[PDB]
Design a protein around this ligand. Structure first.
Ligand SMILES: NC(=O)c1ccc[n+]([C@@H]2O[C@H](COP(=O)([O-])OP(=O)(O)OC[C@H]3O[C@@H](n4cnc5c(N)ncnc54)[C@H](O)[C@@H]3O)[C@@H](O)[C@H]2O)c1
Ligand SMILES: NC(=O)c1ccc[n+]([C@@H]2O[C@H](COP(=O)([O-])OP(=O)(O)OC[C@H]3O[C@@H](n4cnc5c(N)ncnc54)[C@H](O)[C@@H]3O)[C@@H](O)[C@H]2O)c1
Ligand SMILES: NC(=O)c1ccc[n+]([C@@H]2O[C@H](COP(=O)([O-])OP(=O)(O)OC[C@H]3O[C@@H](n4cnc5c(N)ncnc54)[C@H](O)[C@@H]3O)[C@@H](O)[C@H]2O)c1
Ligand SMILES: NC(=O)c1ccc[n+]([C@@H]2O[C@H](COP(=O)([O-])OP(=O)(O)OC[C@H]3O[C@@H](n4cnc5c(N)ncnc54)[C@H](O)[C@@H]3O)[C@@H](O)[C@H]2O)c1
Lengths: 333, 333, 333, 333
């Protein structure tokens, strides 16, 4: 059971902890967040507006955060170099602050005795992995890796299946995406991204994303064949992917449904989901899949030009794939 | 100006009333709504959560709705065949109830001596017109007419410019659409449309729309080449079109911007807009355009495959177009 | 194990069904709702935007809704006298349609062979009971009863503790309350409650409520000493009571906290809760208490004039009280 | 017109600017905000999610922000001691950052040449003024003043009228308050105000407020007779006070209505409003009154115990009062 420290006890940091506890695939032994002290951590982890009260016990005791009788070391460092992950026993580190996405910044945890670091975001230079799509290309020389973005984890498993069976000539993706922490309650300053500063609950907000091009990194055959953009809308969680693509081989929509469902029951089970029910976004709150294909929502213009819809819990789905990737990395040591 | 009766004093009926008064192109003289009495019509027309309090006077005076000194006859009839449009002097009738959208049902208004009917919705069998696209196909023999859907009025002006300049081989459309009256505040019964019954402000809700199909009706050359679907999101008003289309002729994104903005400054002024600002949805509330191209939000994959974004105030833009079509129909008499 | 039919498979009817199964205190055998056919009930019972996917199996089998392997008879009657509650073995009927709240109208269920009716709302003439306050005044001569309102089940337990210990001279209550099914997604017609027609997700909407007055009926010593009003605010669920009362005997706040906490762990356990944590409304979603005293949110002016705050899940708290009352009435036959 | 410099170009800062231009009572000549450069200021002033687009011109030219052709000097300083207000002609400074609310901190603008400072918020030690209530107590020796909070500006005009006619023995106040910039879009860190950290659009959030107590500063006869608390709710703007008070002299609700209405038509014109319509909060967006009595929402228990209800646009009503106070101060020089 690989021991894990979390840097950044935010949405992703706390839900990784819930998924680590829930699945037992990894063990959280240390947490670091300079803006959330140990008593505050008890509160932030126990109560959750989106995913509900934690089902379990959580207390502060002898300076450690004790969750289900298991004590966790709490640090309060702003500079990742000064965290002593080694003496806390943390071998792997989840880099879920949002501000250390480069190998040089993420490498700071290796000074502290961490063995490897998993950035919970896309990186400019760290190798990116998507469970079920290219994770087997991880090898032990990579001490710093990225689990990509939540959108790419929705789009790449779907894209994998469509391209393997039919061939994607080209594709454009829109993601209608839930609100996140970088947004603003009311019109306010947002530096380089003026749209993101506008009132979160008031607006549909266009945003730029590299998540679709990133699919070309996890699936090299799709390099230069996909891009896309995003709309942020006033919901607290759960997001949807809309992939308009042009297929090489003609495929009836029922054929797309059969290979996607088949893949959801086989090698991609737990990653790629399939449904034909009249779902809406709240039906995926706390759903641990990366991607759930929505058979009824999509629509074909003809056998070579289709629009495919897939849901994802950007918070809890992505957190479960951070856990899965660390479990798999542990298994290749 | 032609004298108009309004059947259904809902979102569209009251905003069509506002658009007439504001523009002065047509004159409301009569209104029918069996679920809203005269005093309640003073309240619902005066106050508006989305567009604000009406700027002007509105009162109940001796059985008439008096707006800025002008009296409007009020009817309370469930069956359109019993509305006495002639007596009130109403020559055209805007059918905006949502429940009389076929030729046979909307024709009931001619028994009451109205001369023409304009259905504020798509119709299965009435001729469909869109200002700036095919409205010069209207002729005086058509007594029952559809102004199509808000989404069709957004997409068809943009498609027209693109198809005229580069050729649309095929296109798939998504509209992120604000909430409407057919939705529910909490999970509740929704007849044949299960997703529509789910809590409106809690969910992204996939939905069908034939708006993209209906462009093939106002632009016959694109018949069979466009379809799409919708996402209902939790905002009060303003919607956005997301069109992914294949072009015949290679088009750089700068060339698309230029022909669209050229269209907006010329023959499609007031109908198709153009902006390069970092807009969000609220910036189009109470905007009277049919469609506003967002130059920074869209994205090209290559010279023949692009995604184009266009905003539309689904309430007030559409209502202005109903007015415009009636003024145009009037000028043809 | 009393057998129960549900009239009205809405918010309350489906959470009463859920609470019945989850608690085991009563057995649902019959459900009637002319607007939800059998396949639609599978869908509406299984997916819930507010409370999540039902944790168990639900399917349609041989004309029966089969929940956790137990089949339930489905009726589709609009007139209650045509429901054959007797043949389906329903002994008690939960009247949760919102449109049969008086004794003459709710008595229609006795024609079909039901032996008692529990109206899931206030009633003009049927006797009202609140669990933990006055439920022991129920006796076997009463075949039509009302379980009052959600707000009354929150207010009455707190008001009982405060009054039994310090005497309430007079009190005024505001409840800040979540969206309910009678509200509209956008400004639309609302019969005689005009403010209720305005866009639910955009507005704070003042509203009348007889809940505070009704406490005088379940606590007769408080007759004519309490009234109040409501604000409907854009949340899907969970409401809060804000009670401002004059006391007879001087009471410092910490003494009010002490006796309320003591009540919450004694005879009002499971009905009246108590907390000192920094809670907000989502921390009570799917909470089964009638009323949770919020220690840190209240405030006193002096020892005789205080502002008391209590949270309640207006959907799930109330539905459990319906189930609890029917188990109590069954035990007394 | 006194020349005014604005420190903090946020909700209040920008809307004070709008109000100043719309009313012509003071002139804006300088703005300081180190987190919004010139070109971004053009965008943030031009577009407003809550209040609509600026009706007028705004552009950047020669390093100045030019609004309706008049040039405004732009500083980018984090320490108010370094702002050269005097050189830019700014004689009064609106301190609207939220981080310099004491006299020792707000006095920092005096070293730059400003003559007086108006803190846009409550202050621990600066004299507070509420227009229409105690503004005549201002005199020219006062160089650092406070315009109190939005809520105090709503409560004090009403309290004044009620107290001058009937005598307030004691009162308790709840404000149902819209979201502000200090809150979070999702559950995040919030110092020692833990509840303020929870998802703003997801929750009813109880919060402390000094507003009712502050009424005792602007109306000394009521010192120590008022307190209360707050509920933050998911609306972008407009708030409501709920004052529960005991009266000394008996007052039937009609008498309360009558004196509030005559105050709103006389001395408190433009500050205290009166309405009997079925209003909801959106009906007060961009309303410039401090406080609008809602006659139909309130309720009396008896002739000495009553609950009074008053709306306020916390953004624009407060902003207009900052302009009114500065104009009144300028008339006194
Ligand atoms: N849907 C999502 O929320 C989502 C999904 C996928 C990926 N991500 C990404 O994961 C990362 C975390 O995202 P999040 O949503 O949890 O944001 P968040 O704001 O909720 O959490 C960020 C945390 O970083 C903490 N932190 C710890 N050390 C810090 C330090 N030295 N400096 C600054 N902050 C420090 C902060 O206190 C804060 O709690 C981001 O890169 C994000 O883009 C987010
Ligand atoms: N809201 C939009 O964005 C939009 C845009 C374009 C087109 N439309 C279409 O316009 C039509 C009306 O839409 P809406 O949003 O205004 O719905 P709405 O519910 O707001 O208005 C419907 C009105 O019709 C009244 N009504 C019901 N039955 C009636 C009857 N027999 N006779 C007369 N009046 C009756 C209702 O009381 C109500 O006031 C629909 O077909 C809609 O699809 C809507
Ligand atoms: N939602 C709450 O928080 C809450 C709390 C306490 C009490 N109540 C009361 O419970 C009752 C139901 O409330 P709700 O929120 O579930 O409303 P709802 O609209 O969600 O459900 C009402 C159900 O009744 C069905 N129905 C309508 N007419 C019917 C008829 N003749 N016969 C059988 N079924 C019919 C409807 O299809 C609908 O499903 C109301 O009186 C309400 O005041 C509601
Ligand atoms: N928002 C309301 O409803 C309301 C109403 C009445 C009073 N107030 C009070 O007015 C003040 C402004 O609050 P707000 O939320 O509307 O504004 P805000 O949070 O939207 O912006 C405040 C501005 O201060 C800027 N700023 C300028 N100089 C600064 C400096 N040295 N350091 C830090 N920031 C600087 C920041 O960029 C920011 O834009 C607060 O004290 C508030 O309590 C607010």
């Amino acid at each position: 059971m690989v021991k894990v420290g979390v840097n950044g006890f935010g949405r992703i940091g706390r839900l990784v902890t819930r998924a680590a506890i829930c699945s037992g695939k990894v063990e959280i032994v240390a947490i670091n967040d300079p803006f959330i002290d140990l008593n505050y951590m008890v509160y932030m982890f126990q109560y959750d507006s989106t995913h509900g009260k934690f089902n379990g016990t959580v207390k502060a005791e002898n300076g450690k955060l004790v969750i289900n009788g298991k004590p966790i070391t709490i640090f309060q460092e702003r500079d990742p170099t000064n965290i002593k992950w080694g003496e806390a026993g943390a071998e792997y580190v989840v880099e879920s602050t949002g501000v250390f996405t480069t190998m040089e910044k993420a490498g700071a945890h290796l000074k502290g005795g961490a063995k490897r670091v998993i950035i919970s975001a896309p990186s400019a230079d760290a190798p990116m992995f998507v469970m079920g799509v290219n994770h087997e290309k991880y090898d032990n020389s990579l001490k710093i890796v990225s689990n990509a973005s939540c959108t790419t984890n929705c789009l790449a498993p779907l894209a994998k299946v469509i391209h393997d069976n039919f061939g994607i000539v080209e594709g454009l993706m829109t993601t209608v995406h839930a609100i996140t922490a970088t947004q603003k309650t009311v019109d306010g300053p947002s530096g380089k991204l003026w749209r993101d500063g506008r009132g979160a609950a008031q607006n549909i907000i266009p945003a730029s994303t590299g998540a679709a091009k990133a699919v070309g990194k996890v699936i090299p055959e799709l390099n230069g064949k996909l891009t896309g953009m995003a709309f942020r809308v006033p919901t607290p969680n759960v997001s949807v992917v809309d992939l308009t693509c042009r297929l090489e081989k003609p495929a009836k929509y029922d054929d797309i449904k059969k290979v996607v469902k088949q893949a959801s029951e086989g090698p991609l089970k737990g990653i790629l989901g399939y449904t034909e029910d009249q779902v809406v976004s709240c039906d995926f709150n706390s759903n641990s899949h990366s991607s759930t294909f929505d058979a009824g929502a999509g629509i074909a213009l003809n056998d070579n030009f289709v629009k495919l819809i897939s849901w994802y819990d950007n918070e809890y789905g992505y957190s479960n794939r951070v856990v899965d990737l660390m479990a798999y990395m542990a298994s290749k040591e």
